[PDB]
Design a protein around this nucleic acid. Sequence first.
RNA 1: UUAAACCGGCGUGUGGC
Lengths: 50, 147, 235, 322, 199, 79
Amino acid sequence: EIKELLKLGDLPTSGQIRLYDGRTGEQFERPVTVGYMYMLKLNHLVDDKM
Amino acid sequence: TTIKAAKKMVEREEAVVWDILDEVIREHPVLLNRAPTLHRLGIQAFEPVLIEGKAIQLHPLVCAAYNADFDGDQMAVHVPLTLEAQLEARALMMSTNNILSPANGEPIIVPSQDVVLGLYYMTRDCVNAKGEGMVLTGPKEAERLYR
Amino acid sequence: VTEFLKPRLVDIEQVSSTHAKVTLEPLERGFGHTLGNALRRILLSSMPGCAVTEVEIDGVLHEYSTKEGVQEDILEILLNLKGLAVRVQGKDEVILTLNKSGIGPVTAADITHDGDVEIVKPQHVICHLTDENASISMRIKVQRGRGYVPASTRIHSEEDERPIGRLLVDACYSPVERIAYNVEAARVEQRTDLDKLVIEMETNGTIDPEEAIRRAATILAEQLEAFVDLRDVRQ
Amino acid sequence: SVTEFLKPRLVDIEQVSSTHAKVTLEPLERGFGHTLGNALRRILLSSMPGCAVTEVEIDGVLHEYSTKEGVQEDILEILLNLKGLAVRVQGKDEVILTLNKSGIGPVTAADITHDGDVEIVKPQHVICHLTDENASISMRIKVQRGRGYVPASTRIHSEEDERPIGRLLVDACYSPVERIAYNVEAARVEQRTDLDKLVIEMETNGTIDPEEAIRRAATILAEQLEAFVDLRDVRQPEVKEEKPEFDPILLRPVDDLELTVRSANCLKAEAIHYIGDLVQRTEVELLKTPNLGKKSLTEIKDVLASRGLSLGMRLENWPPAS
Amino acid sequence: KPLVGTGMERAVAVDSGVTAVAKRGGVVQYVDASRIVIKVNEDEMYPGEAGIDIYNLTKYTRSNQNTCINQMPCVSLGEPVERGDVLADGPSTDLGELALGQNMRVAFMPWNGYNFEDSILVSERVVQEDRFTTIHIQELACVSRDTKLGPEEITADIPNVGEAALSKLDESGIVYIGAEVTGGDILVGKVTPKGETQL
Amino acid sequence: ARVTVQDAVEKIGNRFDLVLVAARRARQMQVGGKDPLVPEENDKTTVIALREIEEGLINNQILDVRERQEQQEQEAAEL
RNA sequence: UUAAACCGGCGUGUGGC
Ligand SMILES: [Mg+2]
């Protein structure tokens, strides 16, 4: 079902697209997988422990 | 002239205090420390370089010696403050002088997952690829052809 | 202020006179990476020069061979010829002969001294020879190309089916042997971090490394000349 | 040819929308495709002249952590929408824009008091929502032209610029480009083979011009490349005896010593801008200077001699910087 | 809103008491960033002394963990609401749905060792778009202790202090609402006598 | 800079007498105001003392010899 | 005698490694 949802989104079924380097600008072999993750900022900011 | 003027200048955060800081931390090692200290390697000496921010930069390869991942661990740092202490941290506490485990003969500077994974992917050979069956004249030629 | 920063280099180390290390400091937040990468990619492929591309031994006509007179196989011969850097004058393509007998190693100094070419290292050993009654000769044709042209792609086109009955060799028109740029953090009065570039390069000796860097910079500037401010200041 | 190949040229600024634009550079010989593509992409995404908002001031609110009776969103969301607002200034580098609005409705970019040198790239950008009949907002917006991206914290320069309570600081994020994609293709050369045409598309704020931005990026790249186009051993450490003893700071004009403007023009009546000449000017030329009476002379004596300097000191090395 | 979810997010957001849930259905009359006016429908209206409801949202105030808690309205004028509907998306909520943090583009590859053990690499686009910038409220409380010799006062006449430190103070002795402070600066003028008796 | 000091220990054994000799050498360098026997690269006194030991110029024995020479100089100066 | 300079103890709870 994730596969068919990706298909409806026109995005690759495997989730691995070919990425180009940010600095050298070359093509990365073995395409990396990329997505949208849900990340959280924890209550351990550096400005309170330093 | 007086120490009060120097204190006011260092409290004002001028630019003239910075090059002095580069001069005084050029060859002044500090003492890196872990909160739980199990073995002698939990304490080490390191040459600091000034980095912006509020976090301590540490060599990844020595992390395996501290047994302290990056999941929020807080490490401490002290100063030798004394000639004897500085040369002692250099001689008997430098990370370069402590590379072999004090328990057995295996090196404690064993590489970690990232570099070993990169090297394994690099040296893992396949059956057919670009530039197969050719001849190379040297490692520099190989690097040039790969780039 | 729309005005950027220009670096003030600190060191041009010329150790071994053929493997140099140029440092540059400082650059903008991300200019070091792009500058190093562009210069590297230009010097690797798009850097014209001259090198051997055709080899023809009048005794053997194959890469694979069991040829006496030399204790090294033909593949070693081709590998030694591949590294033979020669600087050519206005001529774009020329052949040379290496008729020589003797005892020990046939080297590059035994090449017929033409007036259109110049060997950068006559002391370059080519092929060790049998110590008696061994006289092997070969011709080598060089070309003025763009960069690294491998064997597979080249032999597929220049000779439709190998009509002349010829041999091949990996053409390396790029005078640089290796190059690597490393960026580090450098400080100015109080700014966060600036790119300090360190380019360590090594060429075939036909041109100095700083000369190769200068040539790459000039070729990139001439490529960009179509869009670069149309002028010094536009106003 | 075999050497000294030809150079590319710009042949298209085809725009599919107000922001999404496409250019095609051609022709690139070989390997210059990825090289120039990555180089231009990095130069564009890294630094381009931007003119986003940097400082705001609304009469009713004192700090961004407050509210206002009548607006739907908080001051923080207003600052968000202002940061999201893009604009193009042409004449000056910094400008102040006034926005006055009243009555129920979505307050957008079109409602601001525009000018001639200032052009809103898109007026449909909503700023806030007034949700009351007798609800009005009057705000001042500082928009300055700069390079790169700077937060609101480090932008402080003194301890008096933020003393006005209404002066709220938003982190100036001015970068006209948003994303720069590129690719290489087989150029349709008249008589040749495998020539690379570089197609570069840019999704931007619509403020900067596509061709102008590409050309500016090329300018920056060539200016940086000029550093080592004639590289040689060049050094600028003062490894010598240059240590001077003249008045170190008194070479800048009088006006930066925290004094009024009338005394500034008064010191200009004697044609003395830099105190490097006034250090050779004792107190006998103070009350002879036109219109130096009681309070102006008081300020002159106070803000000058209290900073460690003395009014009138004999020296002979201010010209040669020694 | 979380791109991926579990269906439970629509419950913990509503069942919690952090958001302003509508007690009586009806229409919304006056939407403001501080208050919400709810005109009750006539069927649910009381037969006597009835009227409308006024929900006073809480502003930025300090919590037990020095975290600001703020309620932001999420309705417009004339929009009808029912009993049990949310009226103001509180902290970590998105249209009646509990949303912890921001969704972001993530790749899984070692980038120059900058993700060595577990470290995270973030781009300047995150901090430029004002994505993770949080707000913290800290409480500073001074007490006027009473001694056996005179009481404690907040007179703004501070001795042996520069005028630059007295600039932020008002006539009373408490700094105005909206004046930032960086270093140790007087914001309460609690100067009191010490001189003993028997004068 | 000086990355490692193992070559300072291979010639001055036990890795602890090196500590003592470096302490005394750098103490005579900082306050005693002696001259570094090698042209330094603008680094700390500790590391120049260690490097001067590294060039085979200073050990404990020649340190005692220099102390005896300074004592003789003091005897001659007191006269 | 006078002058000058300077001038967290305890428990509790929570959380993290
Ligand atoms: Mg841990």
